[PDB]
């Protein structure tokens, strides 16, 4: 069992809010994205310029939860896609 024993709260990835996420609009540009959400802690190293924001928390060994917000730009730096996918069922 995990639940028997302590763990400290584990945070990962960028902080997010519904307010700030809403600031990302189609056609947005990378520096303005940075002003909206700050630099993402991850970016696709394998070719296409897509940024990944992750607000992921594992408090009190209960309910690991996250919003994963995937952003994609064309190579010129203009945003083409948004995917604010919520978490799958956890354990």
């Amino acid at each position: 069992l995990e639940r028997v024993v302590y763990r400290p709260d584990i945070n990962q990835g960028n902080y997010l809010t519904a307010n700030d996420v809403s600031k990302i609009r189609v056609g947005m540009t990378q520096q303005q994205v940075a002003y909206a959400l700050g630099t993402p802690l991850m970016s696709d190293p394998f070719g296409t310029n897509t940024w990944f924001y992750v607000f992921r928390q594992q408090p009190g060994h209960e309910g690991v939860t996250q919003q994963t917000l995937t952003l994609t730009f064309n190579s010129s730096g203009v945003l083409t896609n948004i995917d604010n996918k919520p978490a799958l069922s956890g354990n």
Binding site: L41, M42, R56
Partner: peptide, 17 residues
């Protein structure tokens, strides 16, 4: 082993950069 998965992504990408 701690589960800092974002951190591990970044560090492995570091081992490639």
């Amino acid at each position: 082993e701690r589960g800092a998965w974002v951190a591990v992504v970044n560090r492995v990408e570091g081992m490639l950069r």
